[PDB]
Amino acid sequence: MTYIVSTSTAFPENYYPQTVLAAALRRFFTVMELDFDLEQIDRFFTNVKIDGRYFALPLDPTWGVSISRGLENSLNLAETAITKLLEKTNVQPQDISLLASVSMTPAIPSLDGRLMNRIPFSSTLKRLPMNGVGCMGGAFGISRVADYLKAHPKEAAILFAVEISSALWQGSLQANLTSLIRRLPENPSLYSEIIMDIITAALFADGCGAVLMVGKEHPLAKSGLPQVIDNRSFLVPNTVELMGLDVVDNGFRNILRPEVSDALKQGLRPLINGLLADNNIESENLYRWIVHPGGPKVIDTVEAEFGLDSQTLQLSRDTLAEVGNISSATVLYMLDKVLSEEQSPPDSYGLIVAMGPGLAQEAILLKW
């Protein structure tokens, strides 16, 4: 089995409290003289339960130069996270066999290839650049690397996830919101669309997380480290339209439909109960959950679906409170917290759970 040796994170410079971001969006609503209840901005920016977010891209361009900036910031955060991971484990870049990445940032070549020009990996490094997975990518990545290390038990591998959600604030939100409020009196059907764009504006933030995992025979694979003993994927049929990221002319639009939390119920239990059953364990046997905070409603749905104590998912709400939704990186950040400042009984069980576009969910069974 694969061992989680260590983790690290990296965040951009500017941290805005949630009220400042809501004031910015309201200012845009007022300046363009858009006709939408200004208090609807505050309601959804407040009830997402986020205290403040990191933005790599300014709150004060062209879509080309915005993406170029986002590429640069993605690379910077990934470099910082990988470097501190290597230094805290005392591992040289040439001893890393596989470098896996997840990020919605457009990058051809991928961010991992780009990073080999700033960190001295060997030229024959294997790379695992994934995409089309959105918020699930963090957990997704662990699974893929875990599978990789089953056949490479002597190797070390690094996964990183980095997202620049603030790129939506570089024009896409503005253009789409102006058109939608334009048509609201013409066609009230679009009200639910504006809400979506506001919720997206209230929800998503920037960040990067990284994790070093090793195979069984690797010199760093010691007792007392979290072991990835199994993982599983699930895709809820006929839910493509509930979540995702569409490319539009001026930029992207984020798809997060209100149905999501209900749709998730179709996959959560067969995924998890099936995984645990196939490892002769029940959901009550889990000492800890690390559940991606899709939002307060997503967390509540997991709580209800598994009969969990109201404190069992507090890490999800805590994470969402301090950094917002940093998409694929969130779970890694959470895992980082758990490894760095929380205590795990020997041989206890943990479960990483994430959801995202498809609508797809990933579940990973950890053992201490």
* Contact residues: a second copy, CB under 8 A: 62-64, 67, 101, 104, 106-114, 116-117, 123-134, 143-144, 147-148, 150-152, 232-238, 240, 243-249, 267, 270-271, 274, 356-360
Is the CB of 58 or the CB of 224 nearer to a second copy? 58
Q: How far is the CB of 298 from a second copy (least distance, A)?
A: 17
Q: Is the Cα dihedral 81, 85, 90, 94 positive or negative?
A: negative
Extract long-range pairs of 264-267: CB within 8 Å, 24+ residues apart.
Answer: 264/236, 264/294, 264/298, 264/301, 264/302, 264/355, 264/359, 264/361, 265/301, 265/305, 266/236, 267/234, 267/235, 267/236, 267/355, 267/359, 267/360, 267/361
Nearer to a second copy, 249 or 309 (CB): 249
CB of 121 to a second copy, least distance (A): 8
Catalytic, 208? Answer: no
Question: CA 14, 160, 368: angle at the middle one, nearest 5?
Answer: 110
At closest approach, how far in Å is the CB of 6 from a second copy? 23
Least distance to a second copy from the beta carbon of 133, Å? 6
Q: Which of 362, 149, 148 is nearest to 271 (CA)?
A: 362
Residue number with CB closer to a second copy (67 or 365): 67
- Minimum distance between the CB of residue 50 and a second copy, rounded to whole angstroms? 22
Answer whether 350's CB lies under 8 Å from 288's CB.
yes
Nearer to a second copy, 336 or 362 (CB): 362
Instruction: List Cβ neighbours of 213 (8 Å cut-off, separation of 6 or more).
Output: 2, 3, 4, 5, 142, 145, 146, 149, 156, 157, 159, 228
Of the candidates 135, 162, 201, 268, the residue annotated as catalytic is 135
- Nearer to a second copy (CB atom), residue 42 or residue 163: 163
Which residues are annotated as catalytic? 135
